[PDB]
Design a protein around this ligand. Structure first.
Ligand code: NI
Length: 61
């Protein structure tokens, strides 16, 4: 709940208001994971927030 972050595996460009654009290697907090395919995430690396494809991240663990 504050102990885990995820790492971006690939670059992703959002053209939607609510998606997050990110680069591979960013450190992300998962905010909402109620759905399996799209998660609300916050990038600690950029300070930006938005939905991400869950297949584009893996736990940093
Ligand atoms: Ni935690």
């Amino acid at each position: 709940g504050s102990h885990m972050t995820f790492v971006a595996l690939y670059d992703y460009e959002s053209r939607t208001e609510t998606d997050l654009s990110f680069k591979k290697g960013e450190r992300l907090q998962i905010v909402n994971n109620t759905e399996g395919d799209w998660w609300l995430a916050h990038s600690l690396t950029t300070g930006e927030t938005g939905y991400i494809p869950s297949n584009y991240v893996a736990p940093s663990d």
